[PDB]
Amino acid sequence: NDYTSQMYSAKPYAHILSVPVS
Amino acid sequence: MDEKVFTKELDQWIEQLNECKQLSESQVKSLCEKAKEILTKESNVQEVRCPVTVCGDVHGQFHDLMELFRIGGKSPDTNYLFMGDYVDRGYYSVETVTLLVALKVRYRERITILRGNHESRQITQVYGFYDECLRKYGNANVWKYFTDLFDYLPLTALVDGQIFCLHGGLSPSIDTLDHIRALDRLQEVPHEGPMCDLLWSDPDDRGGWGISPRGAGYTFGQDISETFNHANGLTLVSRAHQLVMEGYNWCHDRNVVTIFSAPNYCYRCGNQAAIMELDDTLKYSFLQFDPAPRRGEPHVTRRTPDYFL
Amino acid sequence: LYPIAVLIDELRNEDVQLRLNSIKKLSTIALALGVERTRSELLPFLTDTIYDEDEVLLALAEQLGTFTTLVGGPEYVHCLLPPLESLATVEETVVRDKAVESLRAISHEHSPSDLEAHFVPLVKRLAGGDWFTSRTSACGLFSVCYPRVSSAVKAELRQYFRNLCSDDTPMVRRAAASKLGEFAKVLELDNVKSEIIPMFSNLASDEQDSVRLLAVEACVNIAQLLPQEDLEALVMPTLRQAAEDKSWRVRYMVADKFTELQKAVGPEITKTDLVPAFQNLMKDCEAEVRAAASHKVKEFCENLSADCRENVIMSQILPCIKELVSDANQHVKSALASVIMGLSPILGKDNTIEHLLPLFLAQLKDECPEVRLNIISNLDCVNEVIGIRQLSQSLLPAIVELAEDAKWRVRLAIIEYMPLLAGQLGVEFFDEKLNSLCMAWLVDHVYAIREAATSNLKKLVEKFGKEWAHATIIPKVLAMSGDPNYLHRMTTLFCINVLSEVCGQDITTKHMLPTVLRMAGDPVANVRFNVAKSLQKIGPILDNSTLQSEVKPILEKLTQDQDVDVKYFAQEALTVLSLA
Amino acid sequence: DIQWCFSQVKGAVDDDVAEADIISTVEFNHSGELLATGDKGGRVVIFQQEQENKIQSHSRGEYNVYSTFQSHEPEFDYLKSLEIEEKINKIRWLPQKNAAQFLLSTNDKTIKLWKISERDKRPEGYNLKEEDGRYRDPTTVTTLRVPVFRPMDLMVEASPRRIFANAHTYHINSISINSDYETYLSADDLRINLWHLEITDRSFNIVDIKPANMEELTEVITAAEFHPNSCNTFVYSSSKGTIRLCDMRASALCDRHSKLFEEPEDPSNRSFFSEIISSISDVKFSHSGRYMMTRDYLSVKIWDLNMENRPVETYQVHEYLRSKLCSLYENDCIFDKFECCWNGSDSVVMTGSYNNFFRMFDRNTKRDITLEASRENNKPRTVLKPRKVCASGKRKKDEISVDSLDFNKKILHTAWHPKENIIAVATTNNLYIFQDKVN
């Protein structure tokens, strides 16, 4: 069991997400 | 005597620049001095008469400027009225700015170039213009020449007293062009003050007053813009310096219009661009266009290349 | 003598440009020192100078190749071998190629005795070294030093070649497979059949594919040698194994070289074996293979057996094209449509209107403008054979639908193509249907389209003649010159400029001159100095009397306007026309 | 079984290194002589082996410095304008062409191509000046002599020969020379290009898994590779466990794979972290050509080119941390791009771990050791002693407790001499050269 309540892993490869412009 | 040889020299310079070839520092110095002695006469507010073809941000994208010239008629056949921003991330920013200033010097009546917010020594140093000058000229003299030249550029422009053109937005401390005539342009634009609002402020869809994210200027709302419009006896305000997907966008009950002239800004946003054609009857129009196909770029082509057959 | 000691101290330098423009004139320094001085002490300074860049060595290689006379001639040419050999080892491929070219060049200077004495051992050293760049550079020297040696040397060289074509690196192997054809060209026929075919097969069946895709060109150059009674016993199995390869690169390289394969192997073997392989290529799984194959359709059918040509064409090739036309990949249709036309003058009018015309109309209703562009540009073949009536009954939908869409590039393309269509179709149908499109373009929004139509007017008029011009061409534009916008007025002036020099002096003076004089009074200054430009351009065709009577006073007036640009241009006009 | 004996140390000697002192990649040559080491900031260094002086045979020479050259400078990409970095990600050695020794090199967004050559000659003399540089009179010249080459000391150089810049949107993280000395690839986090070694202005995108709407990112590429004997088999990894194996023969655009190695996840382990601890980190082939290791975060796994749904073997690196996973997530140590390396002949594997441990499992005898790199407790020609970790409180004078390991000295990158048994483990700031105990 673990208590960091969450259901995502976009943390390490963050810059692959939007960070789009300006 | 000197006028004829100078005109022929300028014609040669324009012809050479038309195929993306830079110049020497002596030529830049002479052209900058001539531009100084020409622009020292024009006041802050300039009344240019119709017809004219309003433009927008070019941001150093030389090929987009060439496409614009191929779309809206080659100079000096068609008048033009730019709104600054010849720097910040263009691939050929020096070529674009020298072409524009050469056209201004040779055709001091046909063309009129306003002042942009991004043409300040610190701003150009931060946003790659200084780097471009270093990597192309090998020194920083031409950058200093262009920066000191930038002071003489007029703030705004007028067309028959009805269509008002400026790079950015208005100011709360400014009410009419009579203060504009009183304001001095031979100084650096600060991060605060009425001139900063003239060059950095933006109109917003929401009401009230907001602070621009760029750290300078304050965003005027609908009410202030409308009060200015009906107070000064104008019909609409033409501005620039805001990226929009569809090229041009009406705003604030069609009072302020946003115009962009650098299609595919920063080569990634993939927007459109348009130029407000203005006729003798003052029936404004628009001519949307797409960025011209270029050559020499590193192509990430899904189609097979010639080395892998 | 001073510039000599100037240049000498520029070889040893620290600037690449100064070194370059000093090495460019090595012939001058050589003539300065002389033959003995050069051969004795200059070349040893050029042998070791491998501390340089691409273009420096690239120029030095050629310069050394061209020194065959400054060293003395065909007695000491074998003294330029150290520097070229030491160039043939660098990594930049262009330098290696220039060095090999210069070596092959100066090889024609050695005496056969000197050949066997020094050049052959150079080939042995280069083709036996360790640094595989040396072996790659040595692969391509046998062709120029083979024919003039003795028998035992020939056997030694063939042994070296066979030891090369079985190397353990892939680069040596591929750079030997390349020159396999040039080597086999000079080998005697019995030696060819005995030795070249085994190496050729071993290459064609190599473990790589970057090595297999050259055996096809090797096969062309070899099959152009053997007698007809052997192209099936020796070469054909390799080719049939190639045309079913597993790596699409070899299939491509087979397709792209199909017409030469046919020419070489001869119509018998073509009609026997190639057509099925051709269909198997055209029904491929990849895109580029079909692209090349379809692109090669016309010339293929145009060289078949003269007797059974129509039979085999109609029986085999047509269904493949009927499948291709309805493909989903753009480039395939774009390639096929542009080449399909060549079949009509060989199939005849009946089979044309039966089969070809259906898929012609199926093409003309495509969606990728490039397809319609190609199929419209390439209409002369069918127009020469079946008459343009049955096609012109339906071409107008295509042209009209094409010349009105959004992206102005395709409009510019169809405007570029309009003169060909007008000259190929006929004038009556033109003035009946299409004549409105040029007038609709002349007032288009996008300036580039306006200039395109401007030049199109000149091309069309010089094609037909000035009679149809003053019939259905100029008056309307002069009437249009009164638009509210100034751009269209300047456009009319542009058309007058581009038309005056061909529409006859009488017609100019009687029709357009009053229009120019009226336009000279336009309020906005742009039209006025453009009028000045137009008068400057049009002056020569006019008469001096007309100038003095009407033009000169207009120039004097225009030299007095409120602005300065029209003044400048009118001064230019008066100056270069002797109207001052 | 073999024994490992500390035999050298390099780099800084203290424990207060700056940022640009963190060894970030280590890659042996093809033969074994040279050994690159590109620590952060771009200071690629190159260690030559002291060749065997026939007077002493057993003592295979220690490593000496051979050259040094800055690779990448800081930068600002005004288009996005944030922080174009000066790291070194992946060094790779092209084979022997001539007396030079080429080598690729890559920061996060531009791949150079260096060259290491030797010079031992220079010109001495002039015709317009004397050696002093004091010009003679341009008329005093009467005879002409040509500069000649006279010997000198040995010297090296490193000139950037090509630059494959400006093609990837995201961050490059892999390189692989192909199989034919002509091409190579370089896979960013969503694309894959395929350059040609002598053309610096083109590329050929060959794999793209970018969804049209950038909201739903599910998989990202994490490592690519080619086959050391095949011309047309590249095996790029993924981020959810799968390892696709494309094939550049069927169709040019290899978006349609030809296999899918994928573990059928077991419900007996997935509690809160499998989706983040089951991400591949570096997929290496094997010198033979068949097997293909994939070091994930917690377990080396040896796949096979003829068994899709299952590995042939499996090993556990530091399985005693499956409980500590939670605390490890609290300082971003759960994200750590590890790496492995094969034997010279497919017999042994290895992989870095925490607190300066680097296990090496065994193929044939299934044994596994756990050494420890540390300058203090050893001297050249000593012998290392297999350590022993403990999960529970059974701490009897030969172990290190699980609650005492320092998750700050991570041995990420390692190497292995392509023929002999001279490994080179790269700690946070040093370049240990544990040599074998030759007998």
Tab-separated table of C-alpha atoms in Angstrom, chain C residues 29-370:
chain	number	residue	atom	x	y	z
C	29	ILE	CA	55.604	29.112	-57.811
C	30	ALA	CA	56.618	26.036	-59.805
C	31	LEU	CA	57.530	28.094	-62.871
C	32	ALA	CA	59.426	30.398	-60.506
C	33	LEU	CA	61.586	27.711	-58.895
C	34	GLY	CA	61.881	25.647	-62.076
C	35	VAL	CA	61.664	21.978	-62.965
C	36	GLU	CA	64.685	20.719	-61.015
C	37	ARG	CA	63.978	22.850	-57.940
C	38	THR	CA	60.362	21.676	-57.840
C	39	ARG	CA	61.068	17.964	-58.313
C	40	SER	CA	63.900	18.144	-55.773
C	41	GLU	CA	62.523	20.167	-52.865
C	42	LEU	CA	58.930	21.361	-53.403
C	43	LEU	CA	56.956	18.102	-53.563
C	44	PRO	CA	58.504	16.731	-50.315
C	45	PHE	CA	56.928	19.790	-48.684
C	46	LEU	CA	53.524	18.923	-50.167
C	47	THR	CA	53.637	15.219	-49.294
C	48	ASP	CA	53.293	15.525	-45.508
C	49	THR	CA	51.052	18.622	-45.301
C	50	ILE	CA	48.010	16.711	-44.089
C	51	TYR	CA	47.309	19.273	-41.335
C	52	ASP	CA	44.625	20.934	-43.422
C	53	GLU	CA	40.915	21.263	-44.228
C	54	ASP	CA	38.527	19.912	-46.852
C	55	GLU	CA	38.799	22.565	-49.569
C	56	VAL	CA	42.565	23.048	-49.188
C	57	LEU	CA	43.197	19.382	-49.965
C	58	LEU	CA	40.419	19.457	-52.569
C	59	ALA	CA	42.298	22.109	-54.544
C	60	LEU	CA	45.732	20.599	-53.876
C	61	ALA	CA	44.650	17.255	-55.336
C	62	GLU	CA	43.644	18.775	-58.674
C	63	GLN	CA	46.702	21.039	-58.745
C	64	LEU	CA	48.987	18.038	-58.250
C	65	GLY	CA	47.085	16.128	-60.918
C	66	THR	CA	47.744	18.960	-63.377
C	67	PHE	CA	51.517	19.170	-62.705
C	68	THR	CA	52.345	16.459	-65.269
C	69	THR	CA	54.382	19.018	-67.249
C	70	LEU	CA	55.950	21.284	-64.611
C	71	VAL	CA	57.882	18.299	-63.249
C	72	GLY	CA	59.341	17.722	-66.718
C	73	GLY	CA	57.028	15.355	-68.548
C	74	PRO	CA	56.796	11.587	-69.048
C	75	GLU	CA	60.110	10.843	-67.337
C	76	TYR	CA	59.463	12.178	-63.835
C	77	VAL	CA	55.663	11.917	-63.604
C	78	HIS	CA	56.391	9.057	-61.216
C	79	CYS	CA	57.588	11.663	-58.701
C	80	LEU	CA	54.055	12.936	-58.002
C	81	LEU	CA	53.058	9.532	-56.602
C	82	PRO	CA	53.990	10.143	-52.921
C	83	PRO	CA	51.742	13.204	-52.454
C	84	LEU	CA	48.723	11.799	-54.299
C	85	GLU	CA	49.087	8.458	-52.522
C	86	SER	CA	49.190	10.249	-49.172
C	87	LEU	CA	46.078	12.170	-50.223
C	88	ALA	CA	44.282	8.948	-51.174
C	89	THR	CA	44.172	8.023	-47.472
C	90	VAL	CA	42.274	10.962	-45.920
C	91	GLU	CA	38.686	10.435	-44.791
C	92	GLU	CA	36.705	13.168	-46.578
C	93	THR	CA	35.140	11.309	-49.501
C	94	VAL	CA	35.388	14.247	-51.910
C	95	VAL	CA	39.148	14.471	-51.354
C	96	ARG	CA	39.543	10.744	-51.989
C	97	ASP	CA	37.515	11.016	-55.187
C	98	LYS	CA	39.552	13.970	-56.447
C	99	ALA	CA	42.770	12.098	-55.658
C	100	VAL	CA	41.576	8.983	-57.491
C	101	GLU	CA	40.544	11.120	-60.466
C	102	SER	CA	43.957	12.786	-60.625
C	103	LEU	CA	45.668	9.397	-60.324
C	104	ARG	CA	43.635	7.973	-63.205
C	105	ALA	CA	44.457	11.142	-65.145
C	106	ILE	CA	48.240	11.044	-64.744
C	107	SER	CA	48.201	7.276	-65.286
C	108	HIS	CA	47.955	8.033	-69.014
C	109	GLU	CA	51.468	9.565	-68.890
C	110	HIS	CA	53.742	6.831	-67.530
C	111	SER	CA	55.541	4.648	-70.014
C	112	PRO	CA	54.331	1.021	-69.865
C	113	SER	CA	57.761	0.176	-68.456
C	114	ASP	CA	57.395	2.903	-65.827
C	115	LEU	CA	53.799	1.720	-65.398
C	116	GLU	CA	54.782	-1.823	-64.433
C	117	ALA	CA	57.712	-0.426	-62.433
C	118	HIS	CA	56.002	2.093	-60.151
C	119	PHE	CA	52.250	2.401	-60.712
C	120	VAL	CA	51.308	-1.261	-60.292
C	121	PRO	CA	53.258	-1.470	-56.987
C	122	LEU	CA	51.333	1.619	-55.885
C	123	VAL	CA	48.099	-0.258	-56.582
C	124	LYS	CA	49.441	-3.223	-54.619
C	125	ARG	CA	50.343	-1.033	-51.636
C	126	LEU	CA	47.048	0.867	-51.658
C	127	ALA	CA	44.947	-2.287	-52.111
C	128	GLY	CA	46.828	-4.176	-49.401
C	129	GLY	CA	47.084	-1.620	-46.634
C	130	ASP	CA	45.368	-1.647	-43.266
C	131	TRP	CA	43.363	1.586	-43.173
C	132	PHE	CA	40.306	0.587	-45.204
C	133	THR	CA	40.183	4.084	-46.706
C	134	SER	CA	43.288	3.005	-48.617
C	135	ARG	CA	41.544	-0.065	-50.023
C	136	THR	CA	38.446	1.968	-50.902
C	137	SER	CA	40.620	4.428	-52.818
C	138	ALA	CA	42.461	1.564	-54.517
C	139	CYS	CA	39.311	-0.214	-55.714
C	140	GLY	CA	38.966	2.211	-58.614
C	141	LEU	CA	42.446	2.276	-60.159
C	142	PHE	CA	42.607	-1.077	-61.976
C	143	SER	CA	40.494	0.201	-64.872
C	144	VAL	CA	43.137	2.685	-66.046
C	145	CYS	CA	46.232	0.505	-65.498
C	146	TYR	CA	44.978	-2.859	-66.749
C	147	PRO	CA	45.229	-2.857	-70.558
C	148	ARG	CA	48.911	-1.870	-70.847
C	149	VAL	CA	50.587	-4.475	-68.610
C	150	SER	CA	51.853	-8.006	-69.209
C	151	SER	CA	49.961	-11.266	-68.713
C	152	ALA	CA	51.297	-12.228	-65.277
C	153	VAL	CA	50.602	-8.693	-64.054
C	154	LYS	CA	47.043	-9.062	-65.346
C	155	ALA	CA	46.614	-12.285	-63.372
C	156	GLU	CA	48.060	-10.613	-60.275
C	157	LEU	CA	45.652	-7.695	-60.656
C	158	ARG	CA	42.631	-9.962	-61.086
C	159	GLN	CA	43.716	-11.858	-57.974
C	160	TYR	CA	43.945	-8.578	-56.065
C	161	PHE	CA	40.468	-7.605	-57.244
C	162	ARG	CA	38.969	-10.921	-56.160
C	163	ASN	CA	40.691	-10.499	-52.794
C	164	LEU	CA	39.104	-7.039	-52.593
C	165	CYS	CA	35.520	-8.019	-53.440
C	166	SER	CA	35.546	-10.486	-50.505
C	167	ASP	CA	36.694	-8.020	-47.833
C	168	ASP	CA	35.371	-8.183	-44.273
C	169	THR	CA	34.279	-4.553	-43.988
C	170	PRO	CA	31.188	-3.454	-45.922
C	171	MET	CA	32.651	-0.237	-47.304
C	172	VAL	CA	35.424	-1.933	-49.279
C	173	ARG	CA	32.901	-4.448	-50.590
C	174	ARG	CA	30.450	-1.800	-51.779
C	175	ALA	CA	33.135	0.410	-53.315
C	176	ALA	CA	34.331	-2.628	-55.259
C	177	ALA	CA	30.820	-3.652	-56.310
C	178	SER	CA	30.470	-0.141	-57.715
C	179	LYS	CA	33.508	-0.364	-60.007
C	180	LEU	CA	32.776	-3.998	-60.932
C	181	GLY	CA	31.226	-2.849	-64.208
C	182	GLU	CA	34.040	-0.500	-65.203
C	183	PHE	CA	36.523	-3.282	-64.473
C	184	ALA	CA	34.601	-5.974	-66.358
C	185	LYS	CA	34.296	-3.701	-69.401
C	186	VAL	CA	37.982	-4.161	-70.278
C	187	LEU	CA	38.445	-7.826	-69.288
C	188	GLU	CA	38.634	-10.281	-72.175
C	189	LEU	CA	35.412	-12.176	-72.775
C	190	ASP	CA	36.591	-15.632	-71.691
C	191	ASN	CA	38.050	-14.092	-68.534
C	192	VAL	CA	34.723	-12.306	-68.028
C	193	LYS	CA	32.668	-15.501	-68.194
C	194	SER	CA	35.154	-17.359	-66.002
C	195	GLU	CA	35.879	-14.903	-63.181
C	196	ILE	CA	33.538	-11.893	-63.191
C	197	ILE	CA	30.296	-13.881	-62.945
C	198	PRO	CA	31.216	-15.678	-59.671
C	199	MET	CA	32.189	-12.421	-57.948
C	200	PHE	CA	29.080	-10.786	-59.409
C	201	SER	CA	26.796	-13.482	-57.996
C	202	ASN	CA	28.560	-13.483	-54.622
C	203	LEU	CA	28.030	-9.721	-54.443
C	204	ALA	CA	24.404	-9.854	-55.602
C	205	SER	CA	23.697	-12.392	-52.834
C	206	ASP	CA	25.604	-10.547	-50.103
C	207	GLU	CA	24.448	-10.490	-46.485
C	208	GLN	CA	23.866	-6.737	-46.610
C	209	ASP	CA	21.490	-4.834	-48.870
C	210	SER	CA	23.540	-1.639	-49.192
C	211	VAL	CA	25.793	-3.976	-51.158
C	212	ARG	CA	23.078	-5.801	-53.131
C	213	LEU	CA	21.554	-2.612	-54.488
C	214	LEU	CA	24.626	-2.053	-56.712
C	215	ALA	CA	24.640	-5.512	-58.297
C	216	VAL	CA	21.718	-4.281	-60.419
C	217	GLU	CA	23.792	-1.623	-62.175
C	218	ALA	CA	26.597	-4.177	-62.342
C	219	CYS	CA	24.129	-6.514	-64.069
C	220	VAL	CA	23.190	-3.864	-66.626
C	221	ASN	CA	26.817	-3.121	-67.481
C	222	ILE	CA	27.684	-6.827	-67.670
C	223	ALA	CA	24.639	-7.895	-69.693
C	224	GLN	CA	25.580	-5.253	-72.228
C	225	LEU	CA	28.630	-7.485	-72.931
C	226	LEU	CA	27.726	-11.175	-73.079
C	227	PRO	CA	26.259	-12.684	-76.262
C	228	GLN	CA	22.525	-13.305	-76.426
C	229	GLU	CA	23.022	-17.062	-75.979
C	230	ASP	CA	24.343	-16.426	-72.457
C	231	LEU	CA	22.157	-13.702	-70.882
C	232	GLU	CA	19.870	-16.502	-69.652
C	233	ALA	CA	22.541	-19.014	-68.633
C	234	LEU	CA	24.602	-16.545	-66.578
C	235	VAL	CA	22.881	-13.237	-65.783
C	236	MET	CA	19.124	-13.858	-65.820
C	237	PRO	CA	18.918	-16.000	-62.626
C	238	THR	CA	20.581	-13.230	-60.616
C	239	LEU	CA	18.130	-10.687	-62.028
C	240	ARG	CA	15.080	-12.854	-61.333
C	241	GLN	CA	16.355	-13.289	-57.778
C	242	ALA	CA	16.817	-9.516	-57.497
C	243	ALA	CA	13.320	-8.598	-58.681
C	244	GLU	CA	11.860	-10.484	-55.688
C	245	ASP	CA	14.304	-9.200	-53.046
C	246	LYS	CA	13.188	-8.848	-49.434
C	247	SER	CA	14.553	-5.333	-48.800
C	248	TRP	CA	12.620	-2.710	-50.757
C	249	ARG	CA	15.832	-0.845	-51.604
C	250	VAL	CA	16.882	-3.499	-54.124
C	251	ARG	CA	13.373	-3.573	-55.603
C	252	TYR	CA	13.507	0.202	-56.015
C	253	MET	CA	16.923	0.115	-57.666
C	254	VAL	CA	15.599	-2.556	-60.036
C	255	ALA	CA	12.579	-0.443	-60.979
C	256	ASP	CA	14.590	2.752	-61.490
C	257	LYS	CA	16.864	0.888	-63.937
C	258	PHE	CA	14.186	-0.937	-65.913
C	259	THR	CA	14.495	0.577	-69.397
C	260	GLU	CA	18.237	-0.093	-69.547
C	261	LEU	CA	17.582	-3.662	-68.395
C	262	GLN	CA	15.145	-4.079	-71.276
C	263	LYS	CA	17.492	-2.499	-73.830
C	264	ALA	CA	20.324	-4.778	-72.719
C	265	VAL	CA	18.600	-8.133	-72.252
C	266	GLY	CA	16.721	-7.758	-75.532
C	267	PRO	CA	13.052	-7.869	-76.489
C	268	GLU	CA	12.857	-11.674	-76.401
C	269	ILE	CA	13.874	-11.921	-72.750
C	270	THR	CA	11.814	-8.822	-71.936
C	271	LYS	CA	8.592	-10.261	-73.372
C	272	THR	CA	9.417	-13.593	-71.738
C	273	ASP	CA	10.321	-12.619	-68.166
C	274	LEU	CA	10.201	-8.878	-67.422
C	275	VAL	CA	6.489	-8.150	-67.907
C	276	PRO	CA	5.409	-10.487	-65.052
C	277	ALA	CA	8.128	-9.008	-62.852
C	278	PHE	CA	6.978	-5.559	-63.971
C	279	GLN	CA	3.433	-6.256	-62.793
C	280	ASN	CA	4.761	-7.708	-59.538
C	281	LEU	CA	6.653	-4.444	-59.052
C	282	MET	CA	3.605	-2.327	-59.828
C	283	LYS	CA	1.488	-4.216	-57.262
C	284	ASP	CA	4.155	-3.702	-54.584
C	285	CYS	CA	3.525	-3.129	-50.871
C	286	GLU	CA	5.636	0.041	-50.514
C	287	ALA	CA	4.969	3.495	-51.962
C	288	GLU	CA	8.239	4.505	-53.627
C	289	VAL	CA	8.468	1.237	-55.567
C	290	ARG	CA	5.088	1.878	-57.178
C	291	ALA	CA	6.147	5.497	-57.688
C	292	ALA	CA	9.208	4.555	-59.739
C	293	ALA	CA	7.438	1.730	-61.585
C	294	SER	CA	4.444	3.836	-62.632
C	295	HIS	CA	6.811	6.667	-63.538
C	296	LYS	CA	8.480	4.230	-65.953
C	297	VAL	CA	5.274	3.122	-67.736
C	298	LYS	CA	5.402	5.000	-71.041
C	299	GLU	CA	8.983	4.304	-72.138
C	300	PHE	CA	8.527	0.645	-71.186
C	301	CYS	CA	5.530	0.033	-73.445
C	302	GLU	CA	7.112	2.242	-76.118
C	303	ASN	CA	9.981	-0.232	-76.663
C	304	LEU	CA	8.253	-3.636	-76.618
C	305	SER	CA	8.224	-6.145	-79.466
C	306	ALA	CA	7.099	-4.196	-82.530
C	307	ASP	CA	4.887	-7.101	-83.622
C	308	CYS	CA	3.138	-8.096	-80.379
C	309	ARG	CA	3.198	-4.583	-78.865
C	310	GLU	CA	-0.517	-3.739	-78.848
C	311	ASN	CA	-1.466	-7.303	-77.911
C	312	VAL	CA	0.712	-7.543	-74.801
C	313	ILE	CA	-0.088	-3.955	-73.796
C	314	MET	CA	-3.867	-4.364	-73.925
C	315	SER	CA	-3.699	-7.855	-72.438
C	316	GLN	CA	-1.438	-7.218	-69.451
C	317	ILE	CA	-0.499	-3.629	-68.663
C	318	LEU	CA	-3.841	-1.798	-68.667
C	319	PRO	CA	-5.532	-3.410	-65.603
C	320	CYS	CA	-2.515	-2.511	-63.472
C	321	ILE	CA	-2.903	1.144	-64.458
C	322	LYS	CA	-6.658	0.946	-63.882
C	323	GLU	CA	-5.848	-0.145	-60.337
C	324	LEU	CA	-3.116	2.474	-59.878
C	325	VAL	CA	-5.302	5.432	-60.874
C	326	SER	CA	-7.565	4.842	-57.856
C	327	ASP	CA	-4.737	4.720	-55.308
C	328	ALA	CA	-4.580	6.546	-51.972
C	329	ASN	CA	-0.958	7.742	-52.024
C	330	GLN	CA	-0.430	11.178	-53.567
C	331	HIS	CA	2.957	10.747	-55.239
C	332	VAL	CA	1.846	7.573	-57.034
C	333	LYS	CA	-1.012	9.308	-58.848
C	334	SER	CA	1.097	12.440	-59.343
C	335	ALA	CA	3.740	10.353	-61.101
C	336	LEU	CA	1.440	8.100	-63.130
C	337	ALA	CA	-0.884	10.818	-64.445
C	338	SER	CA	2.018	12.770	-65.933
C	339	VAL	CA	3.280	9.847	-68.039
C	340	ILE	CA	0.145	7.865	-68.897
C	341	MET	CA	-0.537	9.895	-72.042
C	342	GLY	CA	2.161	8.275	-74.191
C	343	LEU	CA	0.014	5.169	-74.648
C	344	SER	CA	-2.596	6.777	-76.920
C	345	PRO	CA	-0.431	7.349	-80.055
C	346	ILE	CA	0.470	3.653	-79.906
C	347	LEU	CA	-2.945	2.227	-78.963
C	348	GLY	CA	-4.863	4.153	-81.620
C	349	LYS	CA	-8.010	6.238	-81.502
C	350	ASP	CA	-10.520	3.414	-81.030
C	351	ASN	CA	-8.820	1.743	-78.070
C	352	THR	CA	-8.112	5.243	-76.743
C	353	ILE	CA	-11.734	6.397	-76.615
C	354	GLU	CA	-12.681	2.935	-75.345
C	355	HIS	CA	-10.308	2.498	-72.393
C	356	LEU	CA	-8.061	5.523	-71.826
C	357	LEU	CA	-10.657	8.307	-71.867
C	358	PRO	CA	-12.644	6.777	-68.939
C	359	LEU	CA	-9.661	6.924	-66.595
C	360	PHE	CA	-8.648	10.289	-68.057
C	361	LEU	CA	-11.970	11.646	-66.808
C	362	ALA	CA	-11.424	9.700	-63.581
C	363	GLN	CA	-8.109	11.526	-63.150
C	364	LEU	CA	-9.525	14.954	-64.013
C	365	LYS	CA	-11.834	14.564	-60.997
C	366	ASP	CA	-9.025	13.986	-58.488
C	367	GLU	CA	-8.392	16.033	-55.338
C	368	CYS	CA	-4.629	16.692	-55.328
C	369	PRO	CA	-4.081	19.712	-57.632
C	370	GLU	CA	-0.746	18.297	-58.800
